[PDB]
Amino acid sequence: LGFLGAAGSTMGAASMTLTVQARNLLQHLLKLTVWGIKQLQARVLAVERYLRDQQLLGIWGCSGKLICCTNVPWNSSWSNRNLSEIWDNMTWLQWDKEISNYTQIIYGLLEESQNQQEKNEQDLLALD
Amino acid sequence: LGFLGAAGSTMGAASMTLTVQARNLLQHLLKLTVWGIKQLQARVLAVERYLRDQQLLGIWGCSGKLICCTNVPWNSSWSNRNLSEIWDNMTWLQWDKEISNYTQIIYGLLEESQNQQEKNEQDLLALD
Amino acid sequence: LGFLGAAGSTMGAASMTLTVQARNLLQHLLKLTVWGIKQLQARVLAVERYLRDQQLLGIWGCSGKLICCTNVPWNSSWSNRNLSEIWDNMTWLQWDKEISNYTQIIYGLLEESQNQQEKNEQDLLALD
Amino acid sequence: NLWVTVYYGVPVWKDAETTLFCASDHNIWATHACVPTDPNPQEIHLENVTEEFNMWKNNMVEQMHTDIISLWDQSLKPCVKLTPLCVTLQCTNVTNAITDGELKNCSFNMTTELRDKKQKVYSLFYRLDVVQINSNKEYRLINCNTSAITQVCPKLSFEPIPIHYCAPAGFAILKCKDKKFNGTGPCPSVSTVQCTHGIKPVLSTQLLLNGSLAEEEVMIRSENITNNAKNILVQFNTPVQINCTRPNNNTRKSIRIGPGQAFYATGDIIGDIRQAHCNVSKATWNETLGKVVKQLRKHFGNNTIIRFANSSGGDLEVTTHSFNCGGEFFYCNTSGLFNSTWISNDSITLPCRIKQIINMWQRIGQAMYAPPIQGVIRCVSNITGLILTRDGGSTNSTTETFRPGGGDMRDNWRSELYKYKVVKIEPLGVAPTRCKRRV
Ligand SMILES: *[C@@H]1O[C@H](CO)[C@@H](O[C@@H]2O[C@H](CO)[C@@H](O[C@@H]3O[C@H](CO)[C@@H](O)[C@H](O[C@H]4O[C@H](CO)[C@@H](O)[C@H](O)[C@@H]4O)[C@@H]3O)[C@H](O)[C@H]2NC(C)=O)[C@H](O)[C@H]1NC(C)=O
Ligand SMILES: *[C@@H]1O[C@H](CO)[C@@H](O[C@@H]2O[C@H](CO)[C@@H](O[C@@H]3O[C@H](CO)[C@@H](O)[C@H](O)[C@@H]3O)[C@H](O)[C@H]2NC(C)=O)[C@H](O)[C@H]1NC(C)=O
Ligand SMILES: *[C@@H]1O[C@H](CO)[C@@H](O[C@@H]2O[C@H](CO)[C@@H](O[C@@H]3O[C@H](CO)[C@@H](O)[C@H](O)[C@@H]3O)[C@H](O)[C@H]2NC(C)=O)[C@H](O)[C@H]1NC(C)=O
Ligand SMILES: *[C@@H]1O[C@H](CO)[C@@H](O[C@@H]2O[C@H](CO)[C@@H](O[C@@H]3O[C@H](CO)[C@@H](O)[C@H](O)[C@@H]3O)[C@H](O)[C@H]2NC(C)=O)[C@H](O)[C@H]1NC(C)=O
Ligand SMILES: *[C@@H]1O[C@H](CO)[C@@H](O[C@@H]2O[C@H](CO)[C@@H](O)[C@H](O)[C@H]2NC(C)=O)[C@H](O)[C@H]1NC(C)=O
Ligand SMILES: *[C@@H]1O[C@H](CO)[C@@H](O[C@@H]2O[C@H](CO)[C@@H](O)[C@H](O)[C@H]2NC(C)=O)[C@H](O)[C@H]1NC(C)=O
Ligand SMILES: *[C@@H]1O[C@H](CO)[C@@H](O[C@@H]2O[C@H](CO)[C@@H](O)[C@H](O)[C@H]2NC(C)=O)[C@H](O)[C@H]1NC(C)=O
Ligand SMILES: *[C@@H]1O[C@H](CO)[C@@H](O[C@@H]2O[C@H](CO)[C@@H](O)[C@H](O)[C@H]2NC(C)=O)[C@H](O)[C@H]1NC(C)=O
Ligand SMILES: *[C@@H]1O[C@H](CO)[C@@H](O[C@@H]2O[C@H](CO)[C@@H](O)[C@H](O)[C@H]2NC(C)=O)[C@H](O)[C@H]1NC(C)=O
Ligand SMILES: *[C@@H]1O[C@H](CO)[C@@H](O[C@@H]2O[C@H](CO)[C@@H](O)[C@H](O)[C@H]2NC(C)=O)[C@H](O)[C@H]1NC(C)=O
Ligand SMILES: *[C@@H]1O[C@H](CO)[C@@H](O[C@@H]2O[C@H](CO)[C@@H](O)[C@H](O)[C@H]2NC(C)=O)[C@H](O)[C@H]1NC(C)=O
Ligand SMILES: *[C@@H]1O[C@H](CO)[C@@H](O[C@@H]2O[C@H](CO)[C@@H](O)[C@H](O)[C@H]2NC(C)=O)[C@H](O)[C@H]1NC(C)=O
Ligand SMILES: *[C@@H]1O[C@H](CO)[C@@H](O[C@@H]2O[C@H](CO)[C@@H](O)[C@H](O)[C@H]2NC(C)=O)[C@H](O)[C@H]1NC(C)=O
Ligand SMILES: *[C@@H]1O[C@H](CO)[C@@H](O)[C@H](O)[C@H]1NC(C)=O
Ligand SMILES: *[C@@H]1O[C@H](CO)[C@@H](O)[C@H](O)[C@H]1NC(C)=O
Ligand SMILES: *[C@@H]1O[C@H](CO)[C@@H](O)[C@H](O)[C@H]1NC(C)=O
Ligand SMILES: *[C@@H]1O[C@H](CO)[C@@H](O)[C@H](O)[C@H]1NC(C)=O
Ligand SMILES: *[C@@H]1O[C@H](CO)[C@@H](O)[C@H](O)[C@H]1NC(C)=O
Ligand SMILES: *[C@@H]1O[C@H](CO)[C@@H](O)[C@H](O)[C@H]1NC(C)=O
Ligand SMILES: *[C@@H]1O[C@H](CO)[C@@H](O)[C@H](O)[C@H]1NC(C)=O
């Protein structure tokens, strides 16, 4: 189960191996120049793509983690399934298509309603 | 309120939008070479500037946060103001000039007096 | 005690200065091109080497720290010394040779036995 | 009970090799491709640290040699050429007041502004630039049948500005401050630096000029002394001063050769003609080889007659000494520094020859034409070292004979980079402790 491994398995299993895939995300002198830039155009790309996901998880409060849990009540109209027909019977590759259009609705209901609210309450407790 | 947004507002408000500005911090073949390096000289620059601030916050113990609080008693001689004449009546752009000369005095009174001390006390509690 | 500083001192001391060394880990137009790539081949290198260590510490659960402690019982057959003959009487430069062959045995007994186990138990407590 | 703990930022290292930069304070050197230097370098003592160095498996020397020869090639891309320079070029002897046929008065046809009208011009050439083919005498330019000739632009300075190599992040440079270092073995005094000290790329042969002096004695270093296919590097603890002049007082002419191209030739001689020379004093020199004999006598034993003798054959590049004073390339006969046997205001004039079409790197198919300079050259240098080689042959433990060695540019630099070793930092590390993570 290397790169992408259990891509057929149910979502219920599939996630006991997340670190396995997290570690993978990162005299002819004129010809020696062009073919050097073609390597740097890719090496710099993976560093930007790694860092633009970790920031997103820093602003959601889940910095330095791989699984986390939020404080955002799931809506009924985000999918009409059960608790189990998603984990035990679907894959992530299929689930990504299911709620693809609902992504940025969730990502706003994270940060601006979850973490700004709790961060303001922390300074109240320190001031106490 | 996009880039730099509330730059006129008081410091008291001004900081409910910090994540908004955190996400912004990151046959003619010879001509095709020079104008390729001019892009990489900038893309690599923003990655270094992002990472040289997150390290500074890792060593201050405030890793993975945006607002934090320390354990360093503020000195009277660092400014002669009140609690409120700084937050409710000044801006950050003006406050940056106020204590500009006092920056690295604070940054040493962070790390070497705050976090080294607490980190040594943690291993005492584990050894208990 | 700058770069590498107390490299002669015992391991027992030697580590009160870890942040000191953590901050160090990061018309002739054709000639102006070759000698530009030789700078980017090094600047991109230090960013990859920094990020490939922080990830390793994210997956071990010690994200955003410099000293941490795990939950992995040290084996007797990993060295036959005392508690004190390692800290008070050896250096890190010598200790690195001592258990060099035993590195990846430890790094597997981290992550797959330490942090996967605790992370699954957290969702049990949330479900309670 | 013990548990694993993790430390990040631990001062351990490994050996590694990498591409170093350049740093310094319209020359072909430093001003083009370097960065501004560190105003305040540091030198961190590391007490109790003992490393082992090896100056002959160091790779700082070979990658510098790569980067030096690249600078001389990537700079000369925009420097005209001299494809039309080859001509039958009838020539005579210069008739001036001459104390001596080592300078000739040639004449040849070249193209004028219009590319349809002949133009009969002339200039001076040294004896070494002129080849006889077969009445009067028809000569050919040298290195026409092998290579193509490129004139080094007469606006570019060549002066050796010192170089400072600096390591990038995640690396470090060590330095062995102690003495009595025959390039290998341990080192009790190690420090840590950001940048190597001043290195001045000076392409000499058989005798090291403007080098770094030794500490107390003459330091003799070689890979193996019983191996004859190796060079021996001697290093002086006191300089020996040398003075090269020439009474030239030459002139500069120019010939337009195509639209927007210019060829700088030698004009005429305003004065008399005398050869060049180079003076060394017979007292600081004769009591320097005594010091070298004393350290050579220590390796080979006692009752070893030590002879010195000149170079036994080869190209002009390896049997003479070649300077560069002011922008001219000399070839001086030094077979009078080395003519001596050792058992138990007077100076030496070294004659010299000058050539204008040279081949600095002993390559194939490359040449460059050195433009002349106006005025008389007076250059003062001091000698800090010798490159020796030993003759093999018969087993008589009564006499050894040493000759000047040469044939390699990677020995001018190995004499200077024997102090450093590039390491690699590894920040992670584990160790056991009495500490437990509570969940
Ligand atoms: C190292 O030193 C040795 C001396 O110990 C030196 O060997 C000598 O080299 C010279 C040339 O450099 C030789 O001299 C030749 O001697 C013959 C006699 O056999 C002469 O006829 C030669 O005359 C030539 O030049 C004339 C013009 O000057 C011409 O008109 C004539 O036709 C000849 O071409 C020439 O002088 C000499 O034989 C040797 N050996 C000795 C014992 O002198 C050696 O060259 C030095 N090494 C280097 C690299 O210079
Ligand atoms: C090398 O030989 C060349 C040609 O043989 C010399 O060039 C020629 O030098 C003579 C000097 O007697 C010039 O003659 C005089 O020139 C002036 C001005 O041109 C004129 O007014 C006089 O009546 C007389 O003719 C001659 O012009 C000049 N050029 C040519 C093409 O012949 C050269 O001087 C010799 N080299 C050296 C170093 O002297
Ligand atoms: C060994 O090191 C010395 C020290 O730099 C070198 O001496 C210097 O050589 C240069 C050669 O160009 C001299 O420059 C010339 O100076 C005269 C008069 O000052 C001027 O008319 C010229 O335009 C030119 O600038 C310089 O004076 C001289 N001495 C110093 C700097 O003290 C020597 O050349 C080195 N040896 C070799 C082989 O490079
Ligand atoms: C470099 O210098 C050496 C040392 O002077 C040169 O060797 C000497 O060269 C000259 C002329 O080539 C020799 O002079 C001749 O000697 C014979 C001996 O019988 C004499 O009959 C002639 O009239 C003439 O004077 C000299 O002997 C010779 N050797 C010495 C002094 O030991 C050498 O030629 C120079 N090398 C180069 C490449 O120029
Ligand atoms: C691939 O799909 C197959 C479908 O047959 C999965 O195999 C079994 O599927 C049934 C019903 O979906 C489950 O009740 C079983 O537990 C599954 N496993 C076995 C061993 O019978 C299979 O799990 C899927 N994934 C892979 C990686 O094979
Ligand atoms: C810009 O400055 C103006 C100054 O008038 C601020 O407007 C008011 O300022 C007074 C006194 O400073 C406060 O008591 C009010 O609360 C401010 N707001 C309003 C709506 O009257 C203003 O807040 C500043 N910032 C911006 C973004 O306009
Ligand atoms: C370098 O090694 C020396 C060894 O002498 C260390 O100096 C003392 O060593 C003894 C026994 O190892 C200790 O009991 C002392 O406490 C050490 N210190 C002093 C001041 O006497 C020394 O600590 C080592 N490190 C450095 C940086 O010098
Ligand atoms: C320089 O150019 C002139 C002019 O072309 C050459 O003069 C010719 O020389 C040849 C040689 O035999 C004669 O056959 C022609 O009749 C000459 N022409 C003229 C117009 O004089 C001359 O040879 C060239 N070279 C030199 C060295 O002077
Ligand atoms: C280029 O021309 C020179 C002209 O001197 C050639 O040098 C001579 O070549 C012949 C033939 O091999 C030799 O016998 C001579 O000894 C050489 N030297 C002299 C001074 O005449 C040279 O060989 C030519 N280059 C090539 C590649 O043939
Ligand atoms: C080298 O030759 C030039 C001539 O090309 C000499 O220049 C002369 O210098 C003197 C002063 O020393 C002036 O009075 C003359 O007017 C200059 N002549 C010209 C034509 O400009 C120069 O002095 C010579 N250098 C020496 C003798 O070493
Ligand atoms: C180089 O060394 C020679 C060796 O003595 C010096 O020699 C003579 O010096 C006088 C005084 O100027 C002259 O008249 C002679 O013509 C010189 N002879 C020779 C062979 O050079 C000479 O002066 C020294 N010169 C330099 C510049 O060092
Ligand atoms: C090499 O050149 C130096 C510099 O000129 C000479 O040293 C000077 O020699 C003269 C002799 O006329 C003395 O008066 C000076 O005191 C010397 N020193 C200085 C600093 O000028 C040296 O003599 C030359 N060596 C030779 C000719 O072999
Ligand atoms: C090299 O060594 C030889 C051997 O001693 C020298 O030859 C003698 O030199 C002296 C003075 O130079 C003459 O009086 C003798 O006549 C020479 N010997 C013979 C047999 O003629 C030679 O001079 C030395 N050369 C140098 C440059 O030191
Ligand atoms: C659930 O989603 C619908 C539309 O997607 C929205 O109108 C509704 O307010 C959401 N429910 C809650 C409780 O926010
Ligand atoms: C406050 O600052 C002054 C000078 O800036 C310093 O001398 C003084 O010790 C500081 N006060 C405290 C309590 O550290
Ligand atoms: C200690 O190491 C040995 C071999 O290195 C291994 O066989 C043994 O199981 C280890 N002990 C424990 C308790 O895991
Ligand atoms: C001219 O020089 C050649 C070789 O340089 C020589 O053979 C000839 O004798 C010289 N002639 C005169 C007149 O100087
Ligand atoms: C050269 O050195 C030796 C040994 O010092 C000495 O005997 C000899 O006379 C010296 N010769 C000259 C010319 O100084
Ligand atoms: C060689 O000679 C020196 C002269 O100082 C002497 O000290 C040394 O002991 C000798 N060595 C041998 C092996 O004879
Ligand atoms: C060596 O030469 C340089 C430059 O010619 C001179 O400045 C220096 O004083 C000389 N002597 C030394 C370094 O002993």
mmCIF file with all atom_site columns, C-alpha atoms and ligand atoms in Angstrom, chain C residues 73-78 102 105 109, ligand 16:
data_model
loop_
_atom_site.group_PDB
_atom_site.id
_atom_site.type_symbol
_atom_site.label_atom_id
_atom_site.label_alt_id
_atom_site.label_comp_id
_atom_site.label_asym_id
_atom_site.label_entity_id
_atom_site.label_seq_id
_atom_site.pdbx_PDB_ins_code
_atom_site.Cartn_x
_atom_site.Cartn_y
_atom_site.Cartn_z
_atom_site.occupancy
_atom_site.B_iso_or_equiv
_atom_site.pdbx_formal_charge
_atom_site.auth_seq_id
_atom_site.auth_comp_id
_atom_site.auth_asym_id
_atom_site.auth_atom_id
_atom_site.pdbx_PDB_model_num
ATOM   1  C CA . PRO C 1 73  ? 9.959  2.243  26.343 1.00 0.00 ? 73  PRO C CA 1
ATOM   2  C CA . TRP C 1 74  ? 13.677 2.269  25.798 1.00 0.00 ? 74  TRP C CA 1
ATOM   3  C CA . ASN C 1 75  ? 15.080 -1.159 25.173 1.00 0.00 ? 75  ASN C CA 1
ATOM   4  C CA . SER C 1 76  ? 17.938 -2.631 27.125 1.00 0.00 ? 76  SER C CA 1
ATOM   5  C CA . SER C 1 77  ? 19.622 -3.861 23.964 1.00 0.00 ? 77  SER C CA 1
ATOM   6  C CA . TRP C 1 78  ? 19.832 -0.411 22.429 1.00 0.00 ? 78  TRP C CA 1
ATOM   7  C CA . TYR C 1 102 ? 19.758 1.623  15.454 1.00 0.00 ? 102 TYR C CA 1
ATOM   8  C CA . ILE C 1 105 ? 14.386 0.913  14.462 1.00 0.00 ? 105 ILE C CA 1
ATOM   9  C CA . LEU C 1 109 ? 8.703  2.442  17.148 1.00 0.00 ? 109 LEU C CA 1
HETATM 10 C C1 . LIG E 2 .   ? 15.055 -5.317 22.522 1.00 0.00 ? 16  LIG E C1 1
HETATM 11 O O1 . LIG E 2 .   ? 15.813 -5.515 21.316 1.00 0.00 ? 16  LIG E O1 1
HETATM 12 C C2 . LIG E 2 .   ? 15.922 -6.873 20.877 1.00 0.00 ? 16  LIG E C2 1
HETATM 13 C C3 . LIG E 2 .   ? 16.840 -6.864 19.680 1.00 0.00 ? 16  LIG E C3 1
HETATM 14 O O2 . LIG E 2 .   ? 17.350 -5.564 19.430 1.00 0.00 ? 16  LIG E O2 1
HETATM 15 C C4 . LIG E 2 .   ? 14.526 -7.404 20.571 1.00 0.00 ? 16  LIG E C4 1
HETATM 16 O O3 . LIG E 2 .   ? 14.601 -8.760 20.141 1.00 0.00 ? 16  LIG E O3 1
HETATM 17 C C5 . LIG E 2 .   ? 13.671 -7.296 21.823 1.00 0.00 ? 16  LIG E C5 1
HETATM 18 O O4 . LIG E 2 .   ? 12.343 -7.722 21.546 1.00 0.00 ? 16  LIG E O4 1
HETATM 19 C C6 . LIG E 2 .   ? 13.639 -5.859 22.340 1.00 0.00 ? 16  LIG E C6 1
HETATM 20 N N1 . LIG E 2 .   ? 12.905 -5.794 23.590 1.00 0.00 ? 16  LIG E N1 1
HETATM 21 C C7 . LIG E 2 .   ? 11.636 -5.393 23.667 1.00 0.00 ? 16  LIG E C7 1
HETATM 22 C C8 . LIG E 2 .   ? 11.031 -5.392 25.036 1.00 0.00 ? 16  LIG E C8 1
HETATM 23 O O5 . LIG E 2 .   ? 11.007 -5.040 22.677 1.00 0.00 ? 16  LIG E O5 1
#
